[PDB]
Enzyme design. Structure first.
Site, short mmCIF file in Angstrom:
data_model
loop_
_atom_site.label_atom_id
_atom_site.label_comp_id
_atom_site.label_asym_id
_atom_site.label_seq_id
_atom_site.Cartn_x
_atom_site.Cartn_y
_atom_site.Cartn_z
N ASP C 42 0.63 -0.95 0.37
CA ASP C 42 0.25 -0.32 0.18
C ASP C 42 0.97 1.18 0.27
OD1 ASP C 42 -2.66 1.30 1.25
OD2 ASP C 42 -0.90 1.97 1.93
N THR C 75 -3.10 6.78 -2.42
CA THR C 75 -1.97 7.37 -2.10
C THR C 75 -1.36 7.12 -3.64
OG1 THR C 75 -0.01 8.06 -1.31
CG2 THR C 75 -1.04 6.47 -0.49
N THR C 76 -1.41 5.95 -3.60
CA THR C 76 -0.24 5.88 -5.11
C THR C 76 -0.48 6.47 -6.15
OG1 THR C 76 0.69 3.86 -5.68
CG2 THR C 76 -1.23 3.21 -5.25
N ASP C 361 -8.22 -0.12 4.89
CA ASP C 361 -8.89 0.47 3.40
C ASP C 361 -10.08 -0.06 2.82
OD1 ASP C 361 -9.07 0.83 1.12
OD2 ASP C 361 -7.39 -0.36 0.35
N1 LIG Z 1 -9.66 -5.25 -9.28
C1 LIG Z 1 -8.76 -4.84 -9.68
N2 LIG Z 1 -7.83 -5.17 -11.00
C2 LIG Z 1 -7.22 -4.49 -11.72
N3 LIG Z 1 -7.29 -2.86 -11.64
C3 LIG Z 1 -7.24 -2.46 -9.95
C4 LIG Z 1 -8.46 -3.55 -9.36
N4 LIG Z 1 -8.81 -2.69 -8.14
C5 LIG Z 1 -8.33 -2.10 -8.87
N5 LIG Z 1 -8.01 -1.34 -9.09
C6 LIG Z 1 -6.70 -0.32 -9.35
O1 LIG Z 1 -5.42 0.14 -8.73
C7 LIG Z 1 -6.22 1.26 -8.32
C8 LIG Z 1 -6.04 1.99 -7.07
O2 LIG Z 1 -4.74 0.57 -6.01
P1 LIG Z 1 -4.12 0.79 -5.39
O3 LIG Z 1 -2.35 0.43 -5.08
O4 LIG Z 1 -5.12 0.01 -4.32
O5 LIG Z 1 -4.43 2.54 -3.93
P2 LIG Z 1 -3.82 2.43 -3.12
O6 LIG Z 1 -1.81 1.99 -2.43
O7 LIG Z 1 -3.59 3.96 -2.44
O8 LIG Z 1 -4.75 2.27 -1.83
C9 LIG Z 1 -7.34 2.04 -8.69
O9 LIG Z 1 -7.88 3.21 -9.32
C10 LIG Z 1 -7.25 1.02 -10.19
O10 LIG Z 1 -7.39 1.52 -10.84
MG LIG Z 2 -5.83 1.38 -3.29
#
Ligand SMILES: Nc1ncnc2c1ncn2[C@@H]1O[C@H](COP(=O)(O)OP(=O)(O)O)[C@@H](O)[C@H]1O
Ligand SMILES: [Mg+2]
Ligand SMILES: Nc1ncnc2c1ncn2[C@@H]1O[C@H](COP(=O)(O)OP(=O)(O)O)[C@@H](O)[C@H]1O
Ligand SMILES: Nc1ncnc2c1ncn2[C@@H]1O[C@H](COP(=O)(O)OP(=O)(O)O)[C@@H](O)[C@H]1O
Ligand SMILES: [Mg+2]
Ligand SMILES: [Mg+2]
Lengths: 496, 496, 496
Positions: C42, C75-76, C361
């Protein structure tokens, strides 16, 4: 050639301080390892706090201190004269003249120079207001902004006349007698006669009575455990406040209600002082505390137990005025003696210090003019005239002393060259013009750097005290002579 | 060439702060050895907490401080003007003009510049709401985000009018009078008139009464063993709690129930305070404690033994509101004086500080506009107009002072060049366009960097107070002059 | 080129976070001087506990913190978008556009981008269970093993619905409200609603009553010599035992039999507590002690002398269950409020922290979905749609701002490229396929990294709430803008 080394060090200092001689004196900056910076142009400060490892140069400290002590004005003139004198002394040793002959010739030259300056000086009475204003403005020149010259000169002469303590003709217009306060911003229009020493400190307690007419003023300097039982600590506190009550009681019996203490305070102390309504200012220096003691009439009482009503002073008024930004107790009504501190306002700190030095030099010069009562034309006119009459003496004299006297004349003439150079004019052309002018019989033509031309100094209001120039020549002579009199540097045993 | 060295240092600082002049001032990043970073664009910070080993640069600290003290706005304009002035001065010295001639020319140029700025300035009444809004937006420009410009300007004028303390025409709209609180997140819509100083501290005790209407508010500053027998320690504790009961009982006899203390507390102390329902806030600074004392009406009582019912203040309300994340006591109802602290909300810490500086400058500018009642067109229009009339003066005058006055005109014209450059427009083309526009008789054509064109400033609401530009010119003149007047770097004796 | 140097630092951080975007986010390792290692994917942590000596990168700390505060997800995405934005900005300043024009173009682009995301977002009711499950699974993605996705999603929605505190529509489903305990081994099937805060501490004494139905629960925080005669120390022990008896007696008069203390204990203290059968847990943190006080209803009593029967709380049950390896008191029956701690089971410590972050999350995402009630298709679909409509705007607009808007469109489309790259697919081919699909009018075609193809996201259960993407775009915009607005690094005076 250790003599060449000493002469080179003196030359370096002379050239350093050469640039700050005149109305348009390009200022110098003083930077120290601590990083503090002060902009000054009065050569006194410049010679004061500069780093000099060279000891031959380190004598010029003492030369400047002697100059300031006797005359109070003309340190930069003295040092530049010493530089020019050592210039011509060096190249007279280059020709082959022995140093002792140079010293003897300089001695004769300077005897005749003082005599000539006595003859040429025009006299002044102490009632010709325009002449005193001209003397004040000429000395005042150098450090103030061009705008406030008339104002500060007018205040200078007004203070000198109003505080004229007629002590058998010699008026005791001391530097610590005229009333000014220091504060950032505002203007120089606060250099007024406030009859009392004003302290730049706030009242300790708000409900302390700010206004006290005909206040009984006192001056002090003193600074205002084993426990066995639970209540023994309370017992020591009780007896401490009891003896405090006793001493302040016998103080109040005298009637003192305004105090300026030399040392610190405590919250309980100031609270109980303000309980009865007592003013208390702390951390007052030795000099300003003595000044307050002289002004207020309350003698300093180290052993307060013998304070009596006879020992107390009186002041017409004490008031806290929120003038400018800083809060201060504007004490006014010290009726015994005129006593004050050299603290003066301006816009910024650099200009504050500059104006302080400049007003000090102004009172010094007007005091010297009133005392001695002989004024000489400035702006290089006196130097050129004395150089001309020295050349006449050289025509009178013969031998290898004539060369030394000609050297002295040229070294004396170097001052107008510097004064023209700092003004922007070409040095040689205006110097030749001054020589041609003085060869026509008139003696008041000089250089006035405000208008940047050559003109009559007496009609331009550019006139310096005679005694200042006399002491400048004398100090320069002693400096050059005693720097020439050294042979070689040796390691001296340090006193254990 | 130590003068060239000092000029180079001043031109480094001028060029560094050059980029942050205008609405689109590219911000600067200040990093310290501790690693703390703050992003700012207002020139005052950039001159305040930058490192400067160079002493000639170190004077510009004092120049900026004086600018902030008198005006409070225009430090970046002053420094950029000084930079351009020393640029043209340096090119004048390579030509061959003496420095003193440059100083005299700059003095005359700046006297006429202040006169010209006096004539050209358009007057304003204190009731033309649109003009005050335009002034507030022009000053607020630079630091606030583009979105909330209308909002913050509206709140600025609303606070200025509503808190308009009619002190004989000169409204005392001080920086520490208008009510804002600082908190991360949320928005700028909390800059409302909350009639009381709000402290960013939580209640010490939960059951402490959060709501107290018409509360008897007090202000304090004081901080709220040998054992022999088994119970001597217990007796000591009994006596300490007993004297605590007596002091808090004589407090309660006065009736105080809300306190904001300057010093720390203890768990037992806060508990026995909350036992009767007493508010206590700790570690209140000197300035904000004095502000609270002024607002609440409770005089600060160092010696609490003399506290009386007459000494207590009153507040209409005290309430703990969970606004945002941080818990604070939203004090509201201090009815004596309008007193507050410069603490303002935004999203992140950098934006918080940026908005704080921006709002401070906004009240400063609207205060100056109300006081002086003279506004000049901004956006480089005033600079170009004054430069044109200075060139007319140059045509009138003759001599080598004409070159200095033309230098001053070019240096003054450098500001619109900077403002165009930071706006993205080409500097030479838009500067020529501005000169041509001013040659057609109109006076208000400037540069507006919000629209990124050249247009009438009066219709675009881009107008600054006259006085800020007057002081910008004066401070730049003094900086350039006193940097030119320096000659050499000499090591100064450190005070022991 | 200090701006180039800051852009390079931001690019370094952006690329370092780039690899951890998506379900297949290849994790990152945090190794420090102490040698502790935590495996995280994360973006919040990899931005939190990394070394950044660079100050421009140090701003991204504040950017990530702001993102976490408002949204708590994405955030990423924000950092990757900032990286791509500064990529295209670096290209455009390479071409010759001034930075201020880039800032203005990005501002307009992002205003329209937020508007577009508002239009394209599909609405959701809080009763459509499948949609809530899909949103929960989508956000919950990133960190967990593939086996327990359906399970933890089911527990998330079950907890959200069952603990749905209907506070006027806005359900207060806080992170500290849902009941989980942390323990090594076992499985995630212990994330059940246990109505009370469970502490991971053993009973102090074996004979302490493990079972207490309808127990009178109390909450405390307080921590539970000179010799003359031979029996003097025995008298001291006797008296101390006597006040201990007195305070515990007046405690028992209230009836308290279950206590959770904030501080430590002693062997005699716990022995005499268990003599009457009193539970005592020590070293409870501030946060979890406050949570226990809220849950049990027993207000925290610093001074226990004022404890009364009214001050005591009640719990339905308290039980010590030997679940797993660690012995813990499974407190269950806190009937006042839903209060809990974020402590969750898994196999190993790295995995424990991973599912803890993941459940946090997940709850944040479902809370945001229920509150805002607008959901946008994830998997890069929203980014591509907004990019297409931004390109339409670019076709509408004319000037050099069109280049900036195209830059924003490319930077926004960089997210699907990264999401495909981490999935193993070729980036350009699938990017072109997405663009071609979106040109056909459908708006839900994206990338699903589980199946490793391009498919319709709505039927694949890949949907991420609209507010998260809105805040992602906003934070990326502010980061890119305020990193572009800097010019140069200068040394700053440290605060003394
Ligand atoms: N099941 C999925 N398949 C493909 N892409 C996904 C899926 N779930 C989330 N994503 C992508 O991942 C992004 C979020 O990534 P994530 O690493 O969870 O964010 P953070 O690190 O901020 O929590 C979303 O904007 C989306 O485009
Ligand atoms: Mg995310
Ligand atoms: N108004 C003036 N115009 C031209 N020269 C002046 C003027 N006033 C003073 N001077 C010259 O400056 C000399 C004194 O310079 P100054 O630097 O004030 O001395 P100090 O540094 O010792 O105070 C005088 O001898 C005189 O020749
Ligand atoms: N809306 C505007 N458009 C163009 N220029 C402006 C605008 N507002 C102010 N300026 C220019 O910026 C100058 C002040 O810049 P600023 O950085 O705010 O000063 P300071 O740094 O001293 O607060 C003004 O003199 C004016 O010429
Ligand atoms: Mg002098
Ligand atoms: Mg400004």
């Amino acid at each position: 050639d250790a003599r060449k080394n000493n002469i080179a060090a003196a030359r370096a200092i002379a050239d350093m301080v050469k640039t700050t001689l005149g109305p348009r004196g390009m200022n110098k900056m003083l930077v120290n390892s601590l990083g503090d910076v002060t902009i000054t142009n009065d050569g006194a400060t410049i010679l004061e706090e500069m780093d000099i490892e060279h000891p031959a140069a380190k004598m010029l400290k003492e030369v400047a201190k002697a100059q300031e002590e006797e005359a109070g004005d003309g340190t930069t003139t003295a040092v530049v004269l010493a530089g020019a004198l050592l210039e011509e002394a060096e190249k007279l040793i280059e020709q082959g003249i022995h140093p002792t002959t140079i010293i003897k010739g300089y001695r004769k030259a300077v005897d005749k120079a003082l005599e000539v300056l006595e003859e040429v000086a025009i006299p002044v009475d102490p009632d010709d207001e325009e002449t005193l204003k001209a003397v004040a403005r000429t000395a005042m020149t150098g450090k103030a902004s061009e705008e406030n010259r008339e104002e500060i000169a007018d205040l200078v002469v007004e203070a000198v006349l109003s505080l004229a303590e007629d002590g058998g003709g010699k008026y005791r217009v001391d530097l610590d007698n005229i009333k000014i306060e220091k504060q950032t911003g505002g203007g120089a229009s606060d250099t007024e006669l406030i009859e009392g020493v004003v302290l730049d400190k706030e009242p300790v307690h708000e409900d302390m009575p700010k206004k006290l007419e005909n206040a009984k003023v006192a001056v002090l300097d003193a600074p205002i455990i084993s426990i066995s039982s639970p209540e023994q600590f309370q017992a020591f506190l009780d007896q401490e406040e009891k003896q405090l009550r006793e001493m302040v009681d016998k103080i109040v019996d005298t009637g003192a209600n305004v105090v300026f203490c030399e040392k610190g305070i405590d919250d309980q102390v100031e609270h109980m002082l303000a309980k009865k309504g007592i003013l208390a200012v702390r951390r007052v220096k030795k000099d300003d505390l003595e000044k307050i003691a002289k002004a207020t009439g309350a003698r300093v009482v180290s052993n307060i137990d013998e304070l009596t009503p006879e020992d107390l002073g009186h002041a017409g008024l004490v008031e806290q005025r929120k003038k400018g930004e800083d809060r201060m107790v504007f004490v006014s009504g010290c009726k015994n003696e005129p006593v004050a501190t050299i603290l003066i306002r301006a816009a910024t700190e650099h200009v504050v210090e500059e104006l302080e030095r400049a007003i000090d030099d102004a009172l010094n010069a007007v005091k010297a003019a009133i005392k001695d009562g002989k004024v000489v034309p400035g702006g290089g006119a006196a130097e050129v005239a004395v150089a001309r009459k020295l050349r006449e003496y050289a025509k009178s004299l013969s031998g290898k002393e004539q060369l030394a006297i000609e050297a002295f004349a040229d070294a004396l003439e170097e001052i107008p060259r510097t004064l023209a150079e700092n003004a922007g004019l070409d040095p040689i052309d205006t110097l030749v013009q001054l020589r041609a002018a003085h060869e026509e019989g008139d003696k008041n033509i000089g250089i006035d750097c405000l208008t940047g031309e050559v003109a009559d100094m007496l009609e331009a209001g550019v006139i310096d005290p005679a005694a200042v120039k006399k002491q400048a020549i004398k100090s320069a002579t002693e400096a050059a002579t005693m720097i020439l009199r050294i042979d070689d540097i040796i390691p001296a045993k340090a006193p254990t």
